[PDB]
Amino acid sequence: GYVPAVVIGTGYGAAVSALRLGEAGVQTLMLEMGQLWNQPGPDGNIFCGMLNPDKRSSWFKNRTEAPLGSFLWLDVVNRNIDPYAGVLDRVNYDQMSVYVGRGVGGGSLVNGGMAVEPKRSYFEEILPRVDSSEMYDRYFPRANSMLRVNHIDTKWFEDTEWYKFARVSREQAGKAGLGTVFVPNVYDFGYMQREAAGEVPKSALATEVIYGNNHGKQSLDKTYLAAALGTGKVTIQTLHQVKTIRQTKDGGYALTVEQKDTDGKLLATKEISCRYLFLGAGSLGSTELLVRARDTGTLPNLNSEVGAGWGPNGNIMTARANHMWNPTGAHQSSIPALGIDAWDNSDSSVFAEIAPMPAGLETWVSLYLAITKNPQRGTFVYDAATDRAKLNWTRDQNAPAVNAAKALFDRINKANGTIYRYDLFGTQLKAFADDFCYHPLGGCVLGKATDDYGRVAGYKNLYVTDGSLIPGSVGVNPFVTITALAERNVERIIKQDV
Ligand SMILES: Cc1cc2c(cc1C)N(C[C@H](O)[C@H](O)[C@H](O)COP(=O)(O)OP(=O)(O)OC[C@H]1O[C@@H](n3cnc4c(N)ncnc43)[C@H](O)[C@@H]1O)c1[nH]c(=O)[nH]c(=O)c1N2
CATH assignment at residue 343: 3.30.410.10
Q: Looking at the structure, do residues 118 and 152 belong to the same domain, yes or no? A: no
177 is in an annotated binding site: no
Q: Looking at the structure, do residues 187 and 322 belong to the same domain, yes or no? A: yes
Q: Looking at the structure, do residues 53 and 143 belong to the same domain, yes or no? A: yes
CA of 392 to the centre of ligand 1 (A): 21
User: How many angstroms separate the CA atoms of 460 and 456, rounded?
Assistant: 7
Host domain of residue 338: 148-205+315-376+398-434
Task: Provide the sign of the torsion angle of the four alpha carbons 167, 173, 176, 179, taken in this order.
Answer: negative
CA of 14 to the centre of ligand 1 (A): 10
Count of Cβ atoms closer than 10 Å to residue 68 Cβ = 19
Q: Looking at the structure, do residues 423 and 324 belong to the same domain, yes or no? A: yes
Q: Looking at the structure, do residues 290 and 386 belong to the same domain, yes or no? A: yes
Q: Looking at the structure, do residues 89 and 102 belong to the same domain, yes or no? A: yes
426 is in an annotated binding site: no
Contact of 104 with 219, CB cutoff 8 Å:
no
Longest CA–CA span in the chain (Å) reads 71
For the chain, give the secondary structure using H, E and C. CECCEEEECCCHHHHHHHHHHHHCCCCEEEECCCCCCCCCCCCCCCCCCCCCCCHHHEECCCECCCCCCCHHHHHHHCCECCCCECCEEEEEECCEEEEEECCCCHHHHCCCCECCCCCHHHHHHHCCCCCHHHHHHHHHHHHHHHHCCECCCHHHHHHCHHHHHHHHHHHHHHHCCCCEEECCECECHHHHHHHHCCCCCCCHHHCCCECECCCCECCCCCCHHHHHHHCCCEEEECCEEEEEEEECCCCCEEEEEEEECCCCCEEEEEEEEECEEEECCHHHHHHHHHHHHHHCCCCCCCCCCCCCCEECCCCEEEEEECCCCCCCCCCCCCCCCEEEEECCCCCCCEEEEEECCCCCCCCCEEEEEEEECCCCCECEEEECCCCEEEECCCHHHHHHHHHHHHHHHHHHHHHHCCEECCCCCCCCCCCEECCEECCCECCCCCCCCECCCCEECCCCCEEECCHHHCCCCCCCCCHHHHHHHHHHHHHHHHHHHC
Count of Cβ atoms closer than 10 Å to residue 44 Cβ = 7
User: How many angstroms separate the CA atoms of 365 and 37, rounded?
Assistant: 33
Atom number in ligand 1 closest to CA 210: 1
Count of Cβ atoms closer than 10 Å to residue 436 Cβ = 18
User: How many angstroms separate the CA atoms of 345 and 374, rounded?
Assistant: 11
User: How many angstroms separate the CA atoms of 400 and 69, rounded?
Assistant: 21
Instruction: Identify the active-site residue in 353, 362, 487, 491.
Output: 353
CA of 97 to the centre of ligand 1 (A): 14
Q: Looking at the structure, do residues 285 and 137 belong to the same domain, yes or no? A: yes
212 lines ligand 1 (CB under 6 A): no
Atom number in ligand 1 closest to CA 466: 21
103 lines ligand 1 (CB under 6 A): yes
User: How many angstroms separate the CA atoms of 157 and 170, rounded?
Assistant: 12
Nearest CA to ligand 1 atom 16: 107
How many domains is the chain partitioned into structurally?
2
Q: Looking at the structure, do residues 266 and 227 belong to the same domain, yes or no? A: yes
Q: Looking at the structure, do residues 310 and 339 belong to the same domain, yes or no? A: no
Instruction: Give the CA distances from residue 199 to residues 190, 191, 195, 207, in Å, rounded to whole numbers and listed in that order.
Output: 11, 9, 6, 17
Q: Would strands 28-31 and 338-342 be described as parallel, antiparallel, or unpaired?
A: unpaired
Contact of 184 with 149, CB cutoff 8 Å:
yes
33 lines ligand 1 (CB under 6 A): yes
327-346 in b/e form (b: 16+ CB < 10 A) is ebbebbbbbbbbbbbbbeee
User: How many angstroms separate the CA atoms of 158 and 178, rounded?
Assistant: 19
CA of 492 to the centre of ligand 1 (A): 23
Atom number in ligand 1 closest to CA 103: 44
Ligand 1 pocket mutation pick from 19, 33, 437, 473 by most atoms within 8 angstroms of CB: 33
356 lines ligand 1 (CB under 6 A): no
Count of Cβ atoms closer than 10 Å to residue 186 Cβ = 25
Q: Looking at the structure, do residues 231 and 160 belong to the same domain, yes or no? A: no
10 lines ligand 1 (CB under 6 A): yes
Task: Provide the sign of the torsion angle of the four alpha carbons 74, 78, 83, 84, taken in this order.
Answer: negative
Q: Would strands 380-383 and 388-391 be described as parallel, antiparallel, or unpaired?
A: antiparallel
CA of 44 to the centre of ligand 1 (A): 26
Contact of 277 with 245, CB cutoff 8 Å:
yes
467 is in an annotated binding site: yes
CATH number for the domain spanning 124: value is 3.50.50.60
208 is in an annotated binding site: no
Question: Which method resolved this structure?
Answer: X-ray
Q: Looking at the structure, do residues 190 and 121 belong to the same domain, yes or no? A: no
Count of Cβ atoms closer than 10 Å to residue 92 Cβ = 11
User: How many angstroms separate the CA atoms of 97 and 94, rounded?
Assistant: 8
Catalytic annotation present for 331: no
Catalytic annotation present for 195: no
Task: Provide the sign of the torsion angle of the four alpha carbons 395, 399, 401, 402, taken in this order.
Answer: positive
Q: Looking at the structure, do residues 124 and 266 belong to the same domain, yes or no? A: yes
Nearest CA to ligand 1 atom 9: 111
Atom number in ligand 1 closest to CA 116: 48
114 is in an annotated binding site: yes
User: How many angstroms separate the CA atoms of 146 and 144, rounded?
Assistant: 6
CA of 11 to the centre of ligand 1 (A): 6
